[PDB]
Design a protein around this ligand. Structure first.
Ligand SMILES: CCCCCCCCCC(=O)N[C@H]1CCOC1=O
Ligand SMILES: CCCCCCCCCC(=O)N[C@H]1CCOC1=O
Lengths: 178, 178
């Protein structure tokens, strides 16, 4: 169980409490999207996506089970699907449950030709910077990712810690919804 | 979704945050008992039980699915089973999800002969006073009760509100465990 954030203001503590409390009441996809809309309204980004996947033995997604697009550009997602980006996107190779991953950091470390191609295209589409939080359940090798695009979220240590702590609860909600 | 408590101190707010955060990570019966042990250590009682049941159309338990005895006296539970108290105990007739129920209040309103008999026996066994919190999911007509014996918990408005808010999360955990 990931530790709760230190250094939050009373308002930030209350927000996180509200978020986890609300997450525990989510039963439907509509409720989940609506809740993610509200979370996003508190973050310096307009682009959020949650995905649920079946995992390999190293907690990496081997199959996407459910994608809940809250606010990624539909044209970007259409391209991602058409161009087979799932196979090249470094973010889909994360070991879920191992801590938040900053995209710029991960992208800078990419060496493969197809990976670099993807990164260049993501960059042109305003997706060169962002953060992905994750949680995994080995009850049935299933995990979730919460992705937020932009440079500003990663710079807000409090928000990062709050979203990180929310993620396991979003994961349980996503399992219930699925 | 039940509203979060007003008037909590920062320490009480933190406790509730820790409880709901922890509840969302519970996967096994062992984890659930251990967690309930920790919650009980924060309440003026030594007697706690959680039960999961299938519900009728009015959100009353029609069948007990799982009982997790944390600290009810084993002899009391043995008697409860042997003497068919499930059929007479006013607390098992609660409409789950309709707010905390104070036992003394409920017991004072009992008119049936067998009900009164049960109440007299419960009273002799130190179970004349207490509180039952509840939550229900109509996804599959399933609900949980959290019972705590004693007069002192009910007198602590903050604790009552905190436990009440924790209960839906205990319910989701109990479903996962079952
Ligand atoms: C089935 C295809 C739709 C699933 C797309 C899921 C993408 C999740 C990982 C993620 O956030 N990657 C970022 C990295 C840069 O650009 C993206 O998009
Ligand atoms: C299958 C039998 C065991 C299940 C027992 C469940 C009891 C839950 C309701 C409850 O807390 N009633 C109180 C009221 C006074 O005395 C009790 O015990």
């Amino acid at each position: 169980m990931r530790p709760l954030p230190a250094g939050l203001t009373a308002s930030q503590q209350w927000t996180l409490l509200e978020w986890i409390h609300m997450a525990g009441h989510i039963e439907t996809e509509n409720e989940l999207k609506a809740f993610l809309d509200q979370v996003l309204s508190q973050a310096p980004s307009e682009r959020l996506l949650l995905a649920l996947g079946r995992l390999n033995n190293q907690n990496q997604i081997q199959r996407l089970e459910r994608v809940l697009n809250v606010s990624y550009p539909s044209d970007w997602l259409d391209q991602y699907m058409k161009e087979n980006y799932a196979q090249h996107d470094p973010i889909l190779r994360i070991h879920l449950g191992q801590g938040p991953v900053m995209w710029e950091e991960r992208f800078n470390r990419a060496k493969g030709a197809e990976e670099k191609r993807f990164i260049a295209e993501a960059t042109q589409n305003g997706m060169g910077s962002g953060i992905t939080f994750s949680a995994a359940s080995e009850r049935n090798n299933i995990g979730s990712i919460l992705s937020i695009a932009g440079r500003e979220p990663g710079r807000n240590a409090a928000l990062v810690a709050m979203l990180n702590c929310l993620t396991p609860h979003l994961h349980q909600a996503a399992i219930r919804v699925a």
